[PDB]
Amino acid sequence: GDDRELAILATAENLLEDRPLADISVDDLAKGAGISRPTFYFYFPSKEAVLLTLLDRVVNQADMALQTLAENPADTDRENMWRTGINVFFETFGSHKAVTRAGQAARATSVEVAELWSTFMQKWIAYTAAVIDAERDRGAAPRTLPAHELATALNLMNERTLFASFAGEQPSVPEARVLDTLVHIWVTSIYGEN
Amino acid sequence: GDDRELAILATAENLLEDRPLADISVDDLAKGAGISRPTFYFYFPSKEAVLLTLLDRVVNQADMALQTLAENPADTDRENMWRTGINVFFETFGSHKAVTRAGQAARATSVEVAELWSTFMQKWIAYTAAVIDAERDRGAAPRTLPAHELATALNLMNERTLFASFAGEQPSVPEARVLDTLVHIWVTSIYGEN
Numbered sequence: 001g002d003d004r005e006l007a008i009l010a011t012a013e014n015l016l017e018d019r020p021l022a023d024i025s026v027d028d029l030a031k032g033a034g035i036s037r038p039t040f041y042f043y044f045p046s047k048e049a050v051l052l053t054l055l056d057r058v059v060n061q062a063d064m065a066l067q068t069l070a071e072n073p074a075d076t077d078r079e080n081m082w083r084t085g086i087n088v089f090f091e092t093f094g095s096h097k098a099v100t101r102a103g104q105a106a107r108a109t110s111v112e113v114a115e116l117w118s119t120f121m122q123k124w125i126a127y128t129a130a131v132i133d134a135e136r137d138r139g140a141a142p143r144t145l146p147a148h149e150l151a152t153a154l155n156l157m158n159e160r161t162l163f164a165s166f167a168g169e170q171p172s173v174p175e176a177r178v179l180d181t182l183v184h185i186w187v188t189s190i191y192g193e194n
Numbered sequence: 195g196d197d198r199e200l201a202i203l204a205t206a207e208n209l210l211e212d213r214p215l216a217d218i219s220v221d222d223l224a225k226g227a228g229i230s231r232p233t234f235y236f237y238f239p240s241k242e243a244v245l246l247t248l249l250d251r252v253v254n255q256a257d258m259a260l261q262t263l264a265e266n267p268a269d270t271d272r273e274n275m276w277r278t279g280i281n282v283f284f285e286t287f288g289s290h291k292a293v294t295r296a297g298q299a300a301r302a303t304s305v306e307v308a309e310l311w312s313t314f315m316q317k318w319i320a321y322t323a324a325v326i327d328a329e330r331d332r333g334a335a336p337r338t339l340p341a342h343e344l345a346t347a348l349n350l351m352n353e354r355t356l357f358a359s360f361a362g363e364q365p366s367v368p369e370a371r372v373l374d375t376l377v378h379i380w381v382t383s384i385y386g387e388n
């Protein structure tokens with residue numbers, strides 16, 4: 001049941017490291033999970049549905065980590081505050097590169113994946129805008145751009161930049177430099193008067 | 195010849211406003227261009243090849259505009275300098291939304307489109323890094339992040355942010371706000387000490 005479902009998910013994540021979803025068959029997933037093809041269909045309608053579930057788990061893992069971080073007052077300087085927050089995503093997605101990559105590609109062909117991604121981006125944007133708003137209320141950040149618009153561009157930068165780095169795209173920021181790069185751009189853009 | 199090729203390209207751009215490339219047939223393109231299906235194949239191997247040519251034209255149009263801007267000394271303040279440069283892309287791609295959108299989607303399925311996009315991004319990144327380098331050499335910008343890494347993240351932000359805006363994605367910065375948004379983030383990140 002749950003163990004059979006978990007074995008399917010684990011197999012899918014494992015095979016995605018090696019090849020794209022299109023190059024993975026239901027037969028591959030069932031065999032890896034130690035089940036027959038018909039029993040696979042009991043747990044999932046398609047290999048696409050398996051990817052959706054994997055992505056859902058990873059996105060919720062990131063979201064929960066951000067919540068935990070948020071629940072702390074975490075006595076710190078402003079640059080470190082944003083660094084720890086960006087790090088949640090760098091580490092969570094960076095620890096699930098195959099799922100991240102496959103998940104992003106599926107946005108084009110799956111309305112469900114597209115909606116899932118959109119939902120969490122909206123959530124993460126709203127949270128960053130709320131923190132920017134709090135910083136401004138405190139007198140720590142200047143009232144420059146609309147906070148929500150600023151948050152949107154910064155989050156979209158992170159999406160494109162982190163994922164290009166993890167995939168080793170040309171061009172991309174080296175994975176070992178991407179955290180410092182994004183932190184600099186967040187801190188200067190949020191706190192910079194100009 | 196050239197007029198028949200131009201009519202094919204014009205028809206493709208026109209139909210792409212209404213539907214995705216997959217929903218456009220060779221028959222559709224030939225009919226719009228006032229030619230037969232077999233004569234279409236004289237000019238292009240596929241509808242995919244037509245999209246590549248459209249994208250190539252748009253990307254070169256943007257690149258040439260940037261070059262012209264660069265050839266000016268254009269006596270200005272630093273914020274306006276970057277604004278005029280980002281505007282080249284906002285206007286060029288914003289004037290060819292259908293081609294931009296279709297072109298970006300084709301990155302996933304066409305190595306030729308993927309390479310074309312990569313080539314020009316690399317070029318635009320190198321140019322921005324060179325300008326940042328010049329600014330630092332002049333004493334106008336502080337020596338913070340590696341210039342090329344900074345340029346990479348900023349250009350990737352522009353790619354994701356402009357294209358989400360043009361497509362009206364959820365989430366996206368409103369098209370009427372995206373230029374000011376990106377300019378703020380460029381100027382604060384390039385000139386900000388912190």
Ligand SMILES: O=C(Cc1cccs1)N1CCC(c2nc(-c3cccs3)no2)CC1
Nearest residue numbers: 070081082085086089124127128131158159
């Ligand atoms: O990187 C992202 C989100 C991403 C989107 C796509 C890839 S990564 N974020 C969103 C949330 C943002 C944030 N941190 C915080 C913090 C609160 C307390 C410490 S950090 N609030 O918002 C950090 C960076």
Ligand SMILES: O=C(Cc1cccs1)N1CCC(c2nc(-c3cccs3)no2)CC1
Nearest residue numbers: 264275276279280283318321322325352353
């Ligand atoms: O927006 C972009 C490139 C894009 C990439 C993807 C979408 S838009 N750029 C790249 C070049 C950058 C630049 N401007 C300049 C200028 C020289 C002189 C005036 S502006 N140098 O580099 C402006 C912004």
